[PDB]
A paper describes a structure:
Class I is the most studied and comprises four isoforms, PI3Kα, PI3Kβ, PI3Kδ, and PI3Kγ, that share some structural features but that are distinct for protein domains, regulatory subunits, and activation mechanism.
Lineweaver–Burk plot analysis revealed that 37 acts as an ATP‐competitive inhibitor for PI3Kδ, as the plots (straight lines) intersect on the 1/v axis (v=rate of ADP production). Compound 37 binds in the ATP binding site in a canonical mode, as described for other type I kinase inhibitors. Indeed, the X‐ray structure of 9 shows a perpendicular orientation of the phenyl ring to the central core, whereas 37 is characterized by coplanar orientation of the 1,2,3‐triazole to the quinolinone core. A lipid kinase assay confirmed that 64 was not able to inhibit PI3Kα activity at 100 nm, which confirmed the crucial role played by the carboxyl group in the interaction with PI3Ks.
Numbering used by the authors: 109 to 173, 187 to 230, 235 to 291, 316 to 335, 339 to 398, 415 to 445, 452 to 479, 482 to 494, ...
The structure:
């Protein structure tokens, strides 16, 4: 019935829907019914889209940021195929026209009723684009391969659509009553309490009287805060810390003083606390769900009267440049004084102005909000800064989203990971960000795919399980069919975990050959063959993983026995020969961020016409210390290649010569040189140390790349720029001296470095939002500072390039 759907979502999301119901929370009840309708009406809209708009939803085009080629085309019904020669500048229509036209000759006898499917992939070619804007066509040209496509008629596409259908009054100083608690420690117990608006204190942090450290922490005190109740802003957050002293932190807990209906809360409360690492303003505002084990604090919120935060209508009723290029009190005063100027003449300095406004004075907040309601839209870069925890106000949050609505699907995808982490900072379940993500996800299946996995991957974290579960359920209501596709992915991943556990056990008792044989036998079981085959890759939904082909599957020798799983697809040909690595026991989150950043650098470079031949391979956490990495085929580790050469320095170049005979070598050396420049710069900027020959790989094309990003951000040394002699040797064509090739290489590096600096704030804004994620190596200011320093953002370009040159020369000396 709908019974089945409910049980399908419960399995898919990793939480039973009955668990939601058992909280008997209207916030949650309302979140669920609110969004379910929102998601259900989005499904509505889509089931009536035109066939090209459906393609846009389900198969978003994959593009790049004159000359001729051979393309093979067939039609959906037959085996017969035709090979033409087309231009890289041609449109898909022209290609479809030739295809149609021929079929007519051989078929004894209108392009616009067709789209071209990439054989064996969930990828289509359509739209007004040259064939070498399409990533698959591009891929084939740089690799040499022949594009194989299938003419799909509009009515076949519509068959797919149809088969996937579903107040100011209160001047008294704010106060609470700290009643008692129930905890464990060695001393006397103190409760410190403090009121926050983002990172900023709304007043001084009143503390408890000292009470012995045994059993319950009875207090029955009245805590009064240095602030009027009418001055508490909408997003006011009360923050506790319980600790011992003769310092020993024990626990923390936060809550919103206003509930999700704008009512000021009153009065009693049991706060189930989170274990501590001293106040944690950024911490979640929801209680610890381990209500058996957690220490708890009972408090009382006094009745001040029913009081709601005023509606917007009431709210609305109530040397500049030289500092505007982190400032003093008099500077702040100037900026606040100048707010109208700021809006009219420096609209992009909104963030600055927001941080100087007095959130602990309601009158000031009102005047700021009135400016905000007429404020011009901001660039996306500026909106990314506003998503920071430092901007907690809901109107600000809403303004930020409003400026982000113009994000292209491509941009949104590039920033999605960060936007999901920002949900952790949200105060309430129903929020503009969640609505925006769910809307965009329901309009673009790729976005929906990566949103799903970002959420699913953290369900084992109790602070986000509820929020993320709820979002995934909403999403599933909005696409029943995608829900089935994702279940199939879940079933594969479930089987891989079991397979990997077995491998961990077996390798402890037997040789690797024996274990591998057992792995193979396990995989050939009907249940495994079936679970592991015929699915969309979680790494990239457009890649279909068809028949898992064992004999080629193995596992690595390293601790948590990462699995190496290979696939083939008759229908896709060579493009269907794809591999994934399943890893369980390692935290994949830091490879994802890093690989993501590298992707963004590649994109920023390509946007200036600089293609450094980078390899931004897929990486996707799917669960608790679980996830996938995309295999880059026809590549091996530097270590491995340093394995016939008389001198070890030549092993690399000999290998390249062997894979690139004759005049092919010069292209490979160029690919090596550009990619080396890319990764030299990327690893310097990102502070990725511990680079060695086991975690640097090369492709047979010549392109160098990095794997195993365990320790970025100098993490803390200050990782120098690195040039390896073996790499300089290849760049210089195996010559001792070749300053023509070398100083070109030095040019590539400098160009790459200077382009990144120009987008320095993009990197800082993105890393700022990633502080939400609790990555151990992105936890504080010192980590953000690393980026500031590596991009030398405090300098003029010039100064920065001179600085960079010292470092480059530094690195060169180091490489004998
Ligand atoms: O010794 C073996 O039995 C063995 C079995 C299968 C493969 C290998 C060689 N190997 C190991 C790895 C490897 C080891 C540890 C970490 C990683 C990794 N490869 C990775 N990739 C990613 C992109 O595609 C190339 C492989 C990523 C990665 O993080 N890559 N290749 C060795």
């Amino acid at each position: 019935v709908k019974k089945l759907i409910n049980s399908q979502i419960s399995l898919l999301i990793g939480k039973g829907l009955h668990e939601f119901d058992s909280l008997r929370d209207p916030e949650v009840n309302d979140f669920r019914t609110k969004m379910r309708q929102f998601c259900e009406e989005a499904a509505a809209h889509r089931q009536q889209l035109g066939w090209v708009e459906w393609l846009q939803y389900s198969f978003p085009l994959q593009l790049e940021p004159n000359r001729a080629l051979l393309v093979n085309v067939k039609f959906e019904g037959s085996e017969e195929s035709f090979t033409f020669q087309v231009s890289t500048k041609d449109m898909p229509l022209a290609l479809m026209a030739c295809a149609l036209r021929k079929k007519a000759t051989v078929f004894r006898q209108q392009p616009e009723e067709y789209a071209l499917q990439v054989n064996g992939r969930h990828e289509y070619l359509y739209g007004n684009y040259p064939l070498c804007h399409f990533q698959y066509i591009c891929s084939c040209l740089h690799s040499g391969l022949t594009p194989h496509l299938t003419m799909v008629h509009s009515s076949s596409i519509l068959a797919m659509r149809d088969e996937q259908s579903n107040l100011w009054s209160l001047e008294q100083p704010f106060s609470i009553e700290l009643i008692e608690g129930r905890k464990v420690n060695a001393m006397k117990l103190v409760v410190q309490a403090g009121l926050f608006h983002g990172n900023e204190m709304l007043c001084k942090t009143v503390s408890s009287s000292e009470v012995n450290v045994c059993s319950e922490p009875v207090w029955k005190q009245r805590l009064e805060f240095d602030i009027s109740v009418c001055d508490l802003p909408r997003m006011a957050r009360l923050c506790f810390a319980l600790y011992a002293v003769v310092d020993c932190p024990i626990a923390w807990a936060n809550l919103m003083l206003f509930d999700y209906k704008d009512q000021l809360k009153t009065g009693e409360r049991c706060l189930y606390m989170w274990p501590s690492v001293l106040l944690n303003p950024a911490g979640t505002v929801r209680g610890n769900p381990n209500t058996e084990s957690a220490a708890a604090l009972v408090i009382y919120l006094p009745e001040v009267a029913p009081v709601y935060f005023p509606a917007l209508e009431k709210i609305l009723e109530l040397l500049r440049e030289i500092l505007e290029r982190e400032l003093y009190e008099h500077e702040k005063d100037l900026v606040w004084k100048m707010r109208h100027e700021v809006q009219e003449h420096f609209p992009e300095a909104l963030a600055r102005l927001l941080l100087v406004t007095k959130w602990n004075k309601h009158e000031d907040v009102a005047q700021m909000l009135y400016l905000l309601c007429s404020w011009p839209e901001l660039p996306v870069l500026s909106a990314l800064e506003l998503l920071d925890f430092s901007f907690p106000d809901c109107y600000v949050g809403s303004f930020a989203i409003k400026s982000l609505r113009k994000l292209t699907d491509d941009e949104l995808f590039q920033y999605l990971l960060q936007l999901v982490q920002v949900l952790k900072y949200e105060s309430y379940l129903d929020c503009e960000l969640t609505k925006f993500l769910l809307g965009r996800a329901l309009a673009n299946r790729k976005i929906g795919h990566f949103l799903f996995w970002h959420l699913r991957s953290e369900m084992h974290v109790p602070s986000v399980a509820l929020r993320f579960g709820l979002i995934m359920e909403a999403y599933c209501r909005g696409s029943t069919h995608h829900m089935k596709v994702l279940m199939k992915q879940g079933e594969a991943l479930s089987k891989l975990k079991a397979l990997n556990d077995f491998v961990k056990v077996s390798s402890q008792k037997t040789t690797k050959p024996q274990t591998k044989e057992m792995m193979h036998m396990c995989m050939r079981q009907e249940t495994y063959m079936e679970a592991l085959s015929h699915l969309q890759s979680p790494l990239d939904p457009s890649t279909l993983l068809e028949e898992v082909c064992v004999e080629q599957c193995t596992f690595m020798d390293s601790k948590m026995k990462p699995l190496w799983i290979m696939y083939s697809s008759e229908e896709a040909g060579s493009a269907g020969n794809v591999g994934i690595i399943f890893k369980n026991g390692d935290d994949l989150r830091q490879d994802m961020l890093t690989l993501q950043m590298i992707q963004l650098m590649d994109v920023l470079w390509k946007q200036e016409g600089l293609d450094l031949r980078m390899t931004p391979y897929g990486c996707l956490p799917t669960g608790d210390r679980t996830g996938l990495i995309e295999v880059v085929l026809h590549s091996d580790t530097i270590a491995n290649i340093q394995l016939t050469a008389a001198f070890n320095k030549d092993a690399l170049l000999n290998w390249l010569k062997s894979k690139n005979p004759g005049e092919a070598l010069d292209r490979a050396i160029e690919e090596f040189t550009l990619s080396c420049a890319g990764y030299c710069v990327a690893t310097y900027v990102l502070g990725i140390g511990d680079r060695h020959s086991d975690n640097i790989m090369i492709r047979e094309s010549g392109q160098l790349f990095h794997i195993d990003f365990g320790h970025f951000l100098g993490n803390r040394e200050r990782v120098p720029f690195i040039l390896t002699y073996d790499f300089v040797h290849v760049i210089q064509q195996g010559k001792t001296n070749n300053s023509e090739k070398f100083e070109r290489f030095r040019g590539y590096c400098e160009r790459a470095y200077t382009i990144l600096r120009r987008h320095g704030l993009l990197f800082l804004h993105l890393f700022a939002l990633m502080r939400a994620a609790g990555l151990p190596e992105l936890s504080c200011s010192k980590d953000i500072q690393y980026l500031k320093d590596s991009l030398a953002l405090g300098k003029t370009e010039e100064e920065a390039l001179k600085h960079f040159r010292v470092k480059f020369n530094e690195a060169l000396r180091e490489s004998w």
